[model samples]
Target: GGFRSVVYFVNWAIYGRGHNPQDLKADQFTHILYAFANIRPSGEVYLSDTWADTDKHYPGDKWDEPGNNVYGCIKQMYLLKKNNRNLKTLLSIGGWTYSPNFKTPASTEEGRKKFADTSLKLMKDLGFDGIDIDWEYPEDEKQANDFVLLLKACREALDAYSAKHPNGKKFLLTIASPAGPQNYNKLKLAEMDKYLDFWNLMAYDFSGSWDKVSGHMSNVFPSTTKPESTPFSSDKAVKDYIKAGVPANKIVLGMPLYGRAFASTDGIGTSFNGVGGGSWENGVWDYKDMPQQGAQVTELEDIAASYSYDKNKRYLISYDTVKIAGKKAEYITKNGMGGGMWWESSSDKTGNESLVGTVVNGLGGTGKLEQRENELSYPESVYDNLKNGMPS
Candidate 1:
């Protein structure tokens, strides 16, 4: 494998977010992690939204198909993969909101087996290249150990499936890892590394509305002058992972495509009362809808951070700009990191100011990306479209 350009395609983005699988720039990415699939109390993994996952028909989809067929974002992803042979799609299970469901299932051997079995089946049935576990913060030692056990089971299942498959394509297994010390410190990194193909180190969200002080949300290094602004740094997180015996190349630096807003604050490292307003949520704003009018866009080169501050409204939005994303790519190459990963593709812009394209260009263009062929032979898939091919 080589440097990867990964992005998350949220299933719900088809709604108010107005971002669909078709909106993705497939050529610029190596992997599209579909977020997310839900888990039942019985430990079985299932699609969170059937309409978005496979039912809702796109422009070319048939209104009257003969047999069972898959449509919507999933079908589009497979079609995109066919067009861009270098691109692979992975079904991501368990994000922040659904992570709690992992505990009971992850704790028991039978549950672990059930999870592995069902998720792998889902992957094969849906025509995905692999699986991505996004279990947010596996709390204690017991939970951490369970997480490793979960990974072990999934790896074994994937290997067995690959061994039987005719194409001989090894199914990939990855995790959306943490950047904060408080979260990463508890993980069995070395143990987990063996089972995972790579780690998507979520390097953003260092600061947000949860904090009373307005600060940089995703700085690469600590701010020297205003230490308070950078409560956590990606540099320390990367170094900490490396020290924990995980190879540097297996760590993909994660960036944000959105910004965190702070209201009524003097500036970076100051106190704020409210988060004010935003695009979807209360304080969070999408990158495309950011740098609000009268705001001064600034980049802290020393910390490898960038933000837009509306001094008039006293609103501060911390996020990654095009230049900062490029700088982070340089950091990735310099540190021997795997590549870059972004959260939710819907938040990014189209061209010029696009963070996805910026990082891909900075990482030596598409020529340097991993050139692995995505698995297209899903002979046993339930959907006729996947078993053969989406009807032309």
Candidate 2:
């Protein structure tokens, strides 16, 4: 099977902080532009929390600026469009932290209406092609209802705005949803599906040190011993969503460019639980403080059931192989789903390269991925699984 579509995740301003978009040299800009151009980039730029009321991460202070104040990054992206017409940038709102805003706005009909009005205005001001709501989750009955209300309000407001601005393109409304059954079940799938253009399903992060079991963070299939089998594989997740009333074409499978680590002496194959296992940090290393340590430099192709040790600190890191990534990608295509998305762009390799290149490459695209400025290439055997289909 071949992947009919693929989307790159570029959290440029938020992840690539301290780097001015204007300061990017021609070569640097050309590298990304050409790479994406070659791949015929057709995706969304997750402008995470641009309309956020508070500043938490990079470009933190400027986040409060009326409308996505990261004009520099947006301007740079517009430059890419000079040659690549396939790319469609969509401003993403309310990531993990900003999810609370969804609840606040969902508190009442007035609040939802006000949020919708402000959101459409912000998108218009920023020249964004669309909007993506990445609300972490809506746990209970009330939040779930509010979540639907919020989407409806946004649709209404955006429709009105589009009518007034005849030149403005019809805005796309998407959402990033959790893969877990609990979060998935909470959605008013039938009602919410009507307003969303697409649903970005976060299918990774299945198991990590955050959990009690030490397993591949992006495992597609559940272990034979594991329970909760209904939604185990990416295929199953999509199926469940469809059963819940989400259209298959509106579902986009998510892939992870990074891995999860654990510290254990149980022969390295021990399952990790939330407490007994070591803690999980985003960019932290398991052994040394070096940038190349832990998940940063690890590739999906090389990881194996037995190859769990991190060479630097000899720590155990559980991860998937490229074959798994490809299989998941294949599943997406085979099922006639929309496409796939990675967690981020920067985490791949130093040169903004690595498995993402493999993912795009395996999907039958031609693009050159540069290695990070200073990083050693791990052995090929580790990534062999990524080259072939998952072992039977």
Candidate 3:
């Protein structure tokens, strides 16, 4: 396999966000991780939104199709896989909001079994290529041990299906890992790496509204001049993972398609009392809507970070620019990393100024993307058309 480019497609983006699977820049990515499948306290995995996952109809979808079949974003993802053999979709389970649910089931074998069995079934039925675990924080040694058990069960279940299926395709198992020491320090990376195909290092959100001082949210290095401005760095996080026995090539550096905002601040390392308005929520702005009209974008070359600041507004937005994105890509190639992964698909801009496009081009073009084969034959798909391949 070569380098990989993965993007997260949030299920709720279909509503007010107005981004759909059809709107995705599918070709620029080797894989699309459908963001988030919720897990029950009982350890059974399930779709967070049935309407968006498998019921809502797209333009060409036939609502009157006989028997049960998928119609929503999932069906469209299947179509995408057929069109782009290099692309695969994975069902991501657990995220910041739902991570607490992982504690219960992971602690017990029955719970782990139920979680693995149900999630794998959902992945197959929904036409996904693999599974992604996003447990926020394992917290302690006990939780870390449970996490490995969970992964072991999922790896076994995934392989069991592959052995019986005619395609015999290997199913990928990945994870949305943390960047900060407070979080990553708790993970048993060596044991977890045994079952995971790769690690999606969530290298962003080092600083945000939660912090008292204004700082870079996703800088690659710690700032020597203003250490407080870089409380965390992707550079240190990557080193920690490697030290913990995770292969460099199995690490996918994660980037954000948005910026974290700060207001009432002099700049980096200063205390901020407020976080300005955002595209979706206060303190966060979409990349497409960045560098506000009167704001000047500045680059902190020493740390490999960029931000937009407005003197009059006393505001700042920490995010990557096209140049910094290119720098990050160079870092990826130089570090022997698997590739890059983005927090989302919708917030990014298109064409030359597009962060995603910049990183892809900088990584030596989409030609170098991982060439894993995506499954096309879903003999058990409830939808008749999907099972037989959409008619020409």
Output the number of the lDDT-best candidate.
Answer: 1
Q: In angstroms, give how far residue 265 of model 3 lies from its true place.
A: 0.5
Q: What TM-score fits each model?
A: 0.98, 0.68, 0.98
- The list of candidate 2 runs beyond 4 A from truth reads 1-70, 165-168, 225-232, 265-307, 310-314, 350-353, 364-392
Candidate 1 lDDT over 132-200, as tens digits, reads 999997989999999999999999999999989756588999999999888888999998999999999
Whole-model lDDT, model 2:
0.51
lDDT of 1 at 303: 85
Candidate 3 off by > 4 Å: none
TM-score of 3: 0.98
- Which lDDT values do the candidates have, in the order given? 0.91, 0.51, 0.90
lDDT of model 3 at position 92:
96
Cα lDDT tens digits, model 3, 291-324, are: 7898999997767899988999989899999999
Q: Which 10 residues in a row give candidate 3 its minimum summed lDDT?
A: 383-392
